[model samples]
Target chain A: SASEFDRPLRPIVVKDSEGTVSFLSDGDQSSRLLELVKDISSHLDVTALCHKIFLHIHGLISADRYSLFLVCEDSSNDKFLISRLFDVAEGSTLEEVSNNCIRLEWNKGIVGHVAALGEPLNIKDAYEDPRFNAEVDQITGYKTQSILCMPIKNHREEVVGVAQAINKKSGNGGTFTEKDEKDFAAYLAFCGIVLHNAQLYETSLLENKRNQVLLDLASLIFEEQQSLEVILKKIAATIISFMQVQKCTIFIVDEDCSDSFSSVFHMECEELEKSINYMYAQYVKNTMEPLNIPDVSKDKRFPWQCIRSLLCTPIKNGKKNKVIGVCQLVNKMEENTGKVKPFNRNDEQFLEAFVIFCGLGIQNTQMYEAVERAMAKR
Target chain B: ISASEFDRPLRPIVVKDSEGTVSFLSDSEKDQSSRLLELVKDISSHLDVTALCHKIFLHIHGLISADRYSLFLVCEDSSNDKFLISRLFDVANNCIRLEWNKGIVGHVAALGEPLNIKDAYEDPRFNAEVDQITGYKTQSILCMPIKNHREEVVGVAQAINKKSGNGGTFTEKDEKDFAAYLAFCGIVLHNAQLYETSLLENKRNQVLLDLASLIFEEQQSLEVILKKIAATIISFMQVQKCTIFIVDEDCSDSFSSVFHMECEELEKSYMYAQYVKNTMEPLNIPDVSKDKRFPCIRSLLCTPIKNGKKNKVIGVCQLVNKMEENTGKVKPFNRNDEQFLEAFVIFCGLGIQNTQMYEAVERAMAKRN
Candidate 1:
C-alpha cells in the first residue's frame, strides 16, 4: 500500500577526476539517464524535492542511510542546521523517513563541518574520525561504519544544505570510493539550486500566512468595540489557540489611581492574582519591553507557580503610545513534541503585534464609556 | 586519482553529433561544454528577467554564431489580453510587443518547435517589418520555443543572421546546440517568473493590510468610513466606477445608503446586485454583451459584503470597466481585481458595524435620565 509514495531514482553516468566515464546503473539494467535531470526540475516543494534528492544520491552510491540537513536562521540571527526528515534508505517512503527529525548546531558534527567549510568529507571509519559525533548513533542504537557528507551550494556559491550518506552498502569494508564522492558532488550541484528556489517560495507563502492571520485578528477585535468584556473574551480564546498557550491574562492599568489595576481578565484561577505578584508582567509593564522565558526554572529573575515558560508584553494606546495594559501567556507547548518549551522569538514578535490591536480596542471602549458618563452628568 | 578535498565535482562532458547522436566529448565538444556550464551557472543566479536575458545575450556568442539575438516573454494585462513582449534585443534597445500568435516568433511558440531557416526572406512565416524598421538586414535565422518543466512554451528565443561564413547559413548542428541550451533557459525563465509572482503576491497582501489598518484607525461615522473605502477601491483597483450599496439591517427590499465614485445611480433594483446579496457570492463577468446578465457596457465585478460576526451580507460593491494606464482605454476586470476587492471588504464590514453600534449607543444615551 505504501509503495505508491516511493520514487526510485534513475541511474546516471558520471566522470571522475581521471576523465574516466562510468555509469551507475544496475548490472542488467539498460535505461537512459534523462529522467534524472527531469526529476530535479519537476518539483517545487522542498520536502518532496529533498526526498527525491536523497533517493538519487542513494542510487548513485552504495549508501545504506541518507540524511538532508537544511541551514536555517533563527529570529535572533543565529544560524543552525535542521533535518526535517532523516535516516532515509532505498525504497523508504516519505512518512517513514520523516519520523526521525533532528536539530544540530551549525558547526558541530561531520555534516555541519561540511556545511560550514563549504566542502566535502569522506570518512573511511566514522569512529576513527575525531570530527564525528557518536551521540546520534548512541541515541538511535545504530552503528555507523562510514560516512560521505557533502555541502550543497546554490548558484551564488553559498551552502544551503548538507547531504550525508552513511555506512556505504558495498562489500569493500562499507567505505565510499573516490568515484562515489565525485558523482555525489556532481549531482548535488543541481539539487542546491532547486532547494534554494523552493525555500524562497515557502518563505513567501509564510509571509502571506502571517499577514492573513494578523488581518483576521484585526477584524475580530475591531468588530466588537461596544464592550471591553466581550473584546477581552474573544482575545483570550484567539490567543490561546494561535499561540498554543495554556493560560492567558489581560490586566488593565488604572489611569486615575496610577498604581493599581482597574480590572484583570484571567483564563482560569482569577482569585490567586492578588495573593501572588507576577514579576514578569510588572517588569514588562515598567520597561515597556516584551519578556520571553523558555524555561522559567533557570531564570532566577522571576518566580513562577509550576510554570515551565512565560511570555509577557506591554500594551499601549494608539495616540501617545503610553502603556495601558499588560498581557501574559504561560506554558507554551510544542506542536509536534507536545513538551513544555520556552516562548521563542516568533512567539514574542507575534504577541507584540497582536497586543497593539488589543490596546486600541480597549482604549476605544473606555473612551466611549468616559464620554457617556460625562454626558449623563450634564 | 587520489582522494582529495574538492568542492566542485567533475561532470562528464558530452555532446551531440551532426546527426543529433549522443556521444563522448571531442575537442570542440569540450570547449562547448565549458561555455555552456559557465552560462548555466550565470543564468541560474539571476532572478530578474531583464538582467538574465541581458546576460544570456552577452554570453551566447561563445556557444553559437549569431549577428543578433532577441528574447520575448509571455505577458498578460488586467484585461486578460495575452501577448508576447520582447524583454531584450541586441539589434535595438526598444522593447516591442506583438500579438500572441502573430509573427515568426509566435509561430514557433504556437507549434512548440525549433525553426532553422537558411534565408529569412524566403520563409513564409517571417515578417520583415521588424528588420525594415530597424534597418538591419536579415538573412539566416534560428528560432526555438522555450518551455518550462511542464512542457508548455513560456517564451521564444530568436537568433538572426548567422556569422559563420560568406553564405551566413545556420547549420543543423547550430540548431541542435541552440535547442539544448534553450531547454535550460526555459527552466530558469519560468523560475524567475515564479519568483516575481511570489513577490507581487506579498506586496498585494501588504497593501490590503495597510488599508485595513487605515479603516480601523478612523471609525467616526458610517458615511465617512464608506466614503473612504469607496474612494480607495477606485484608486487601488483603477476602475472607472466603484459603487457601494448598504442593504437595510432587516434585510428588507431597500438600501440604507448608496455611495458612488463619479458613477451613475441605480434608479431601480439591479438583479445582479440582488443575486449577489441573496447568494453571498462574488460575480466577475469580463464580457457583459454576450451574457444574459442585467446590464453592463464593458465589464463588471460585484461582491457581497458580509458582516464579520453573523456572516450575513450587509452590502454589495459594484465595480465597472477597468481603465488601462496611460492609454485611457477601457478594459475588462481580471481575477486579481475580484480577489483584492473581496479581501478588502472583510475589513470594511467590521468598520461599518462598529460605527453603527457606536451611533446606536450614542442615541440610547441621549434618551437616558
Candidate 2:
C-alpha cells in the first residue's frame, strides 16, 4: 500500500529516469499523466486530490500488484495513515495484502528498513536477501525477482512514509540499477511536497469557507426576521451541502445527558433517516467508545441495517474535550456509483473540518438565543 | 459673575398703601418651578438639568428686561445658579425686592424652602427694595420663586421692573393677591418645562429618521449630509433662515461656511457669523442696522452650536430674529426668539450621533467589499 504513495512524484521520475526508463511513445501513458496532473491541479477538491493521488499511483506503476500509503497528521495531532491506493491482478484482493504484507516498523523488511532509516533499498532476490520478510512471498504464492523500496521525504528530509514497487519486468533487467533508485527517490520526494501542500491548502480553504458561512448565518439571524425553526433548517441544509454527504443529522444536547439527545433537524432519504436515527440514539446512550465504522454492516459497536459506511464525530462544548453532542453522516455516496460509498480517510478528514465549523456556529447561536430569551422576559 | 454673588437670598417685596399690609406672592412669579421637578425624574439623557432649567427661564421670561432671575438647585455641587426663578411685574415700577424671610414667599422658603420670594418692600418694616436706592420710583413690583422636590424653598426670588396705573404706591390687596398668582405661576412653569422636553424628544426622533434617509442616500457625501441637516432644521423649526458654520480643525481663522440661507438681507456680509463663532454664544440683534455691536448687518439671530461634550462650540447657526414690518430703532429682538435659537443649538448635537452611526456602518461595508 505504501509503495503506491510514490505515484505523485512521477515528474521526478521523468527527470531522473532519462535513458534507462524508456516508454512506448504511442501508448496512452504520457497523455494519461498530463490528464492526471491537470485533473489534480484544477478539478479535484482537496479530499478528492488525496484519493486520486492514490488512484494515480495504482495506474502508473508497472507491477502485477501494488499499494500506496501516506502518513499525515490527523485532527488529533497524531500521525496516521491518511489514505491507501491498491490494485491487484484478477482474483487478488486487499485482504491478502493486509494479512501477509511486511510490517511497517524498522528492521522488519526492505520497506520497513527504508522507512526507518530514510534510505532506499533494492533487493534483486527476496529469498537470497537476509533482510527479506519471506512471509509476503509465502502468502502471495509468487517468487519476487527484484524489489525496490524508497523513503518519501519532505523538503526537510524527514521521512513521511515508504514506497515499495515489487517485481520489475523479468526480461528488461535481471537486477535493479542505481538509475532506478535515483528515479524512485526523486519521484518520492515530489510526492512528499505535493501531497503535503495539497492537504494543507485544502484544509485552510475549508476552514475559511466554514468561517464565512458561519458569519453569514449569524448576520442573517441578527438582521433578518426568521423563526428559530427556519434557521435550524437552513443550518442543516448548509451542513449537508458543504460536507457533500448523502445524509447529515444534527442533534441538540440536553442539559441532562440521560435521555436528553434529540434530532433537531436532518437532510436525508426517509428510509435511511430511520436507520440513522436508531443508530444515533444508541450512540448517544452508549458512551463506551465512539466508533468510526468504515463498513457499517461489519462494525459490531454500531447497529446499522442498510447503511454501508458512517462517520460519527462528537461536538465538544469546552476545550477540556467533553462531548456535548454528536454529528453523524450516514452512507456517504460515491461520486460515480450514485450509491453509498464506504467512509474513507478523506471522509474522516472532511468530517473533522466540518464538525469544528458547526461547533463554532452553534456556540454563537446559543449565546444569541440566550440574549433573546432575556429580552423576551423583559 | 461669581459663585458667591449667587449665594445670597433673592429679594422679596410687600406692598402696603391704604389696603392692609399685604405681601406679594414670590412663589407664583417664576416659570420654572414645576418643570425643574419633572426634569429631575427623567434626567437620563441630560448632563445637567439646571442648564435646561436656565434655557427654559430664558425662553419664558422676556430676556432683555426681566427684573431678576434665579435657578435654585437641589444639588449644590456645581457653581451655577441654584435658585430657580427670576421675575418682574407690571404693578411695581422700578422697585426691586429681595427677601430671605417674612411674607408669603418668605414663609414658603422658611417652611419648605423649595422656593420663596415676597414683594414686602411697600411695608415700612421691610427695607430691601433696590429701586428706591437707584432713584427709580416704583409703584409695585413682582418676584420670581424657586422651589425643590419636597415643595420647599431652596432659594428666594425678586424682580424690579413694575408698571403703575395713575397711582403713587401699590395697593395692599394687589400685593396680597399676587401671592396666589405666584402659586399659579409655579404650575405654569412646570407645564412649560414638560412641553419643552416633549419638543426635544420629537426633535431627536426626527433627527434619527433623517439620519436613516441619509444612510439610504449613501451616494451623497459628508458635505451633502451637513447641508441637508441645515436645511432640515430650518424647515422643521419654521425659521426665516438658517446657516451652519463649522470651525476649522486647527481652531484657527479658517472656518468653513457649510450651509447658509439669507432670508431678508440679500447683500448682508457674513462678518457677524464669524463674530458668533468666535464668541461661542448667541448674538441677538433685532435691528441689525441700528445695533452698534456690528457695523454692517440687517436683522440676525446667531447662536453657537456645540458638540455633545458641551466644551467647545464647533459650529454656528444664524437666523433672522425679526420680521421686516416690525423693524424699529428702539424695538429689539424678542427674548423668546433668542431662547429658541439657544434651544436649536442644543438640538443640533444630534448631528454627532448620526456621524457615529454612519462610521459604524462604513466599517462593516468596508470589510464585506
Candidate 3:
C-alpha cells in the first residue's frame, strides 16, 4: 500500500494575458519548475538574481508589486532585514525600483515576523493582520489588501532572505490562494542556493578590494619615509580622499609622558586646541581601543560644536600591543546626500587596519632618523 | 469578479523537507529530484576544477546506472587550436588529448547533442582503437554534452553500458536524466573555473606588490638594497639560484660585481644571457640542455634590467633552475614565470638606478666636506 496508493490530482488553473484560463498539467508544471531551476541557479550576481527572482515570482502569482528583503548582520551581530529589491511592480524594470529600499527590524513587521519565525504568511486581508504596518501604504499612496510573504533559506537551511508578494491583483478578489503560496515556495527553494552563492561571491570580491587598498597604502607609506611631515601629510590626504572626511588629525605619543602626545599633525585646519583634544585623545590612549562617536553634540566629550561626527583609533607599535600614536577623523561626509553621519562598522574596521600601517611607517621613520644622527655624530 | 473570504483562518507554513520540486511529484520522481538536489549541493561545494570533475565522475555512477564514466574538458592551445583534454577517463586514469572530430566523445562535444547507441559495434562513429588498447569489449554507450549557461558546450560526459538492465542498452529515460543532471554540472564547473582564475590572479598580484615594497625598504646603501633584492627573488620565485650581474663601466661584456643569492654564486655569462643584455629582450629557455644553449643549466629565465632614463641595459638578472613546489624537482619555467620575472626586472632596474645616484651624491658631498 505504501508504494501503490493513488489519489485524485487537481488540475492547476493559470490565466493568460488575454484573461483566458487554462489547465497547467503536472508535466507542464514540472518542466516549468525545471526551467526555473536552470535560470535561477545559473545566475550569480546578487542584484541581477534578485531581479530575476522578482520577475519569476510575478509570472506565477498575480501580484501588484514584490519586495525581496535579504538578511544582514552588523558587526555587533545584530540581524536585520534589508530590502534588496523593493516595490517592484509588474512591467517595471529592476533599475526603476532599486534605488529606494527600506529596512525592518528582525521581528517588527509582517515580513520580519515571517523571517524570524521561519514561516510563510498568506494573509487574505492585509488590514486584519496586526503585524502588517499600515504606515507603508500611507507613505506610498497605495493600498495593500492582501499579502503573501515567505522566508528564503540557503542550502544549509538558514534563513537568507524574505520574499513578499504585496496585494494580489484585484482580478482574483485581491487575495492569494493556497496554490499561489505553494508555487511561490517551490520557486524560492532554488533561489535560496543561487542567492547564497551570489552573496558569497560579492563578499569575496569586497575582501579582495580591501586587500588591494591596504597593500597600496603600505607601498605608499614606506616609499615616502624620508621626511616625517611628508609621510604624515600624504597619509592624511589619502585618508581624506578615501574616507570622505573633512579633517584628519594624528598625534604621536610622548616617550617620557605616557598620557599625552609629543606632537600633533592636522590635515585641513592649521591648528586645534590641544587641551580640548586631550579629552578623547587621552581616553583612546588609556583604553587602546577605537572610539566612534557619530554625534559629538550629544556626547559630553568636548564636545566640538562645529564637528558633528568623529572617528578615532589608536595606532599600535609594530606587532606589540603598546599604543604609539592616535589617528582621528572629524565629520564623515556622505557621498550623494552630503550629510554627516556616524562612522559605521566598515569605517571603523578599515581605519583600524589602516592605522597598523601608519604605526609601521612612523616607527620606521623614527628608526631611520636615529641611525642618521648616529652616523653624523661619529 | 468575486470578493474572497477575509480572515477566515491562519495557518503556520513550514518549509517542506524536499527542495526544487512541487507537492505533485510522484514518489519516484520525488526521489529523483531529491537525488538531483543532493548532487548539485555536493558538486557546487567544490571550487577546484579537477576535484569537481573527479567528484562528478564519482557521483554520476549512482545517479545513472552506468558501468563506467569519463569526463573530457574543452581546452585551447596557445595557438588558438581547440581540443578535448581528458580529465578523468575510463573511470581511473587521465592525460589524453583528442581533436574535436576524433572519437565518440569528440562527436558529442562537436555536435552539442547526446548520442546513445544500442550497440557500439553497430555504430560507425565509434572508434575501435581504444577498445583494442584497453582489451575491453565495446557495448552500449551514452555520451552527452555538458554546456554552460551561455549554451556553449564546455565538456562531454560519457557513460558506458547501462548497469541494472543486465547488459541492456541505455533507454530514453536514462538519456533524459543524464541531460538534466549535466545542466547543473555545467554551471557548477563554470563557477569553479571562474573562482580559480580570480584566486590565481589575486595571488600573482599580491606577490609582485609585496616584492616591490620589499625592494624599496632599504635604499640607504647599494649593498643593503641588492641583498634584499636577491633574497626576495629566491623566496618569491622559488628558484634554485639568483644572480645579479652589474655591468662594468669600461667594457660592456664584463661585470664589475656579481651578487649571488646562494651563498655568493656567476662569472662568464651564458650566450643567451649575453644575447638578452645586448638586445634588451627577455629569453625564457625551458630546457637548456635540449635548446643547444650554454651548459651547467637545467633551465633558466634571463632578462635585462634597463634604466628608464637612457633606456640602457644596466644589468642582467638571471634566475637558474625553477624548482617544483611539491616534488622538489627541477622543472622548466613556463610563460607565467617568464612574465613574472619580466615585471620584477622593471622594479629592480629603477631601485638600482636610484641607489647608484644616492651613492654618487653621498661621495661627492663627503669629498667637499
Give each model's whole-structure lDDT.
Answer: 0.69, 0.45, 0.69
> Is candidate 1 or 2 superior in DockQ?
1
- Tell me the lDDT of model 2 at B121: 52
- Model 1 stretches with alpha carbons more than 4 Å out: A1-38, A62-67, A77-98, A131-146, A166-179, A254-260, A268-286, A293-308, A336-338, A367-378, B1-35, B77-81, B92-94, B263-300, B309-311, B365-369
Can you write out model 3's per-residue Cα lDDT over B17-115, one digit (the tens) per residue? 243111111112104665676577667656678898999888777767777788888765223346888858764333888898778888888888889
| Winner by TM-score | 1
Q: DockQ rank, highest first?
A: 1, 3, 2
Q: Give, for candidate 2 chain A, the lowest lDDT window spanning 10 residues.
A: A6-15
Interface RMSD of each: 17.5, 39.5, 18.4
Select the stronger candidate by lDDT from 1 and 2.
1
* TM value for model 1: 0.80
True contacts kept of each: 0.27, 0.00, 0.06
Give the per-residue lDDT of model 3 (tens digit) for A77-179: 5688887567633465657755767899888899888889889998888889998778868875677888889999886878888998887877547578788
- Per-residue lDDT tens digits for candidate 2, residues A1-378, read 111121221111111244331111102433343334333433213445556555555545554545565555533333433234444445746573344432243445566566667777777777787788777578877776677777776546776666767777556666666766764554455455445544444443333232223323332222211233544555555555544566666666754554566445566743232212556535743562344776756767654435666776666542314454567677766555666655555445444434443443354345434444544443
